[PDB]
Amino acid sequence: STGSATTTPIDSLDDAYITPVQIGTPAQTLNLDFDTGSSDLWVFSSETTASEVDGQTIYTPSKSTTAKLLSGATWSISYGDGSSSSGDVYTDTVSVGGLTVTGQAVESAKKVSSSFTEDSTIDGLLGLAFSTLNTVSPTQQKTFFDNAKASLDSPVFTADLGYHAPGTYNFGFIDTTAYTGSITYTAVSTKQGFWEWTSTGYAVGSGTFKSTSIDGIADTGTTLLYLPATVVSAYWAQVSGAKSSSSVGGYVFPCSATLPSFTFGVGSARIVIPGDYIDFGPISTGSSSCFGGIQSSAGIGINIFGDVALKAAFVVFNGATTPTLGFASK
């Protein structure tokens, strides 16, 4: 089997991407944030505290004839940005772009933190990291990809995120028309439950490539590119007036600037992030200071190849017995 679904930016900045997901019988369609940095499929629901719902579409398991309460099961997750959610668990039928999993754990939120409430466009998350990170207790549950894997034509999914435009998540096949050149594959460590890999270096604009190992995660659920302070400093040094602002919480730059590209290495291959992808707009409405899309990972504890980086590529998440990651230009 295969599946293919369009993923759409939630706003004019590409802060995140939503993909429609069918849950239950009859189908209830929710728009979920596919997140390769976590491993829980959770949704706003009829069980969510009413004051914590503000515009989201909810899953109502009582209206699904295939929903079953997973007795005694609870979940609770906290994300790197400080947001959180928690609740109970059902199993139900879940389909993405034509690909169906029966018995999928659907984690129904009883509580969500303010940042989720305040974002009416995201109805929940669909985790695509490794199932070892799944928070369901006392019996850990598998991700949608893990459940689908054996039925897929090939045990892979691909992320093709758009810049200010729709893109595609495919399951079970590689669309050879979706990228240019070849896909370069690189090793993955699953030791921390992530799609963790090592970039071979970087360049800023038309500058020379610096060969250096940068270990980090391919994370569709993080907006920005988080890299070591030395690298980030080297980038923003090429932008006149750019500085790290303690009050804003990162590098900012004059909105009148033309940003240089940023290149990252994947083995001997090179992925070029155009400068425009690094512009995240005014820090506050009407400001002429703009927020940067490349930020320091210091004090995160890990480098994160988030959407800023991933959207410059066609990305293969290869879930073979020994997982690997593939990157192509597009």
- 192 shares its domain with 104: no
The whole-angstrom separation of Cα 159 and Cα 179 is 11
Both 25 and 117 in a single domain? yes
Does the active-site annotation cover 35? yes
Q: Are 241 and 253 in contact (CB under 8 A)?
A: yes
Q: Are residues 154 and 36 in the same domain?
A: yes
Report the amino acid identity of residue 184. Answer: T
Resolution (A): 1.5
Residue 11 DSSP label = S
Closest to 323 in 3D by CA, of 249, 168, 218, 177: 218
b or e along 181-216 (b: 16 or more beta carbons within 10 Å of the residue's beta carbon)?
eebbbbebeeeebbbbbbbbbbbbeeeeebeeebeb
Q: Beta 156-160 vs 324-328: how paired, if at all?
A: unpaired
- For 191, the enclosing helix (H) or strand (E) is none
Q: Are residues 179 and 162 in the same domain?
A: no
Q: Are strands 184-187 and 262-266 parallel, antiparallel or unpaired?
A: unpaired
Of 55, 12, 47, 50, give the one whose Cα is nearest residue 31: 55
Q: Catalytic: which of 33, 35, 92, 119? A: 35
Count of residues in the chain: 330
Residues 184 and 141 reside in one and the same domain: no
Please tell me whether residue 276 adopts helix, strand or coil conformation: helix
DSSP one-letter code for 163:
S
Same domain, residue pair 209 and 156: no
Given 149, 174, 199, which residue is the final one in a domain? 174
Q: Report the number of distinct structural domains present in the chain.
A: 2
Identify the burial level of 221 via C-beta atoms within 10 angstroms of its C-beta, where 0-12 means exposed, 13-18 middle and 19 or more buried: buried
CB 8 within 8 A of CB 18: yes
Q: Distance (Å, rounded) from C-alpha 268 to C-alpha 291?
A: 31
Catalytic residue among 39, 199, 261, 297: 199
* Residue 117 shares a structural domain with residue 208: no
**How far apart are the C-alpha atoms of 224 and 251, rounded to whole Å?**
12
Q: Which two tokens stand for residue 91?
A: 């199993």
**Residue 24 is part of which domain span?**
5-174
Q: Is-catalytic flag, 81?
A: no
Q: Which of these three, 155, 174, 193, is where a domain ends?
A: 174
